């Protein structure tokens, strides 16, 4: 599936030792056609009580509740998507929703209200690529000493590093990685071209770490 493909793609680049080239030509691996459509722009870890709330770059909001269910509010402010633990999806609206979801809608709004007003948008300067097509939800997440790892249902894996605020957005369908550096500049690369042309030690180190993180996701 997506994670197995991502692992293969990362291993292939990492095995090639991209930073150890005679002449690294990192810029030759850039491909703006592979810029992602979706990534996580902000998040709140309230997992001691309710779960993890997050906002995607399209200003939609989601919550992965502690009971392994998900509720998504589209950026129109009314459309909802509810995903049961099985993955069973239901579409509804805030204006017309079963009373059984009132509590979870209320929790999502508390998350939304906080995030719209008070957190920075990751990738605020990134224009998504032109698309056609499905809104993803948060499948899994965890935190380590160095990063928070966010796995979306479209296969994308996002890794936000705590120390220096650098970020990776990995897509196994594009076989691409977007790297946001500490200055918030960003580049999108085709992983196969990073294997061909190489890259700096900073990006190579984060791609080695990313492979370790995908191993963790695979082990659930």
């Amino acid at each position: 599936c997506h994670l197995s493909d991502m692992l293969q793609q990362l291993h292939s680049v990492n095995a090639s030792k991209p930073s150890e080239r005679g002449l690294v030509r990192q810029e030759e691996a850039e491909d703006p056609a592979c810029i992602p459509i979706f990534w996580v722009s902000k998040w709140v870890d309230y997992s001691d009580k309710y779960g993890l709330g997050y906002q995607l770059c399209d200003n939609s909001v989601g919550v992965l509740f502690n009971d392994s269910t998900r509720l998504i509010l589209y950026n129109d402010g009314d459309s909802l998507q509810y995903i049961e633990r099985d993955g069973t999806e239901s579409y509804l609206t805030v204006s017309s929703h079963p009373n059984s979801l009132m509590k979870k809608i209320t929790l999502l709004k508390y998350f939304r209200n906080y995030m719209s007003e008070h957190l920075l948008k990751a990738g605020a300067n990134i224009t998504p690529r032109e698309g056609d097509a499905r809104l993803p939800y948060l499948r899994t997440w965890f935190r380590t000493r160095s990063a928070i790892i966010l796995h979306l249902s479209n296969g994308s894996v996002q890794i936000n590093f705590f120390q220096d605020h650098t970020k990776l957005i990995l897509c196994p369908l594009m076989a691409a990685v977007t790297y946001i550096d500490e200055k918030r500049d960003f580049r999108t690369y085709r992983l196969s071209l990073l294997e061909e042309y190489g890259c700096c030690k900073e990006l190579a180190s984060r791609l080695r770490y990313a492979r370790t993180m995908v191993d963790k996701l695979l082990s659930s």
């Binding site: 996580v40 902000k42 998040w43 709140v44 870890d45 957190l119 920075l120 990751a122 935190r143 928070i148």
Partner: peptide, 5 residues
């Protein structure tokens, strides 16, 4: 609770 940047 923890927050993004």
């Amino acid at each position: 609770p923890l927050a993004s940047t």
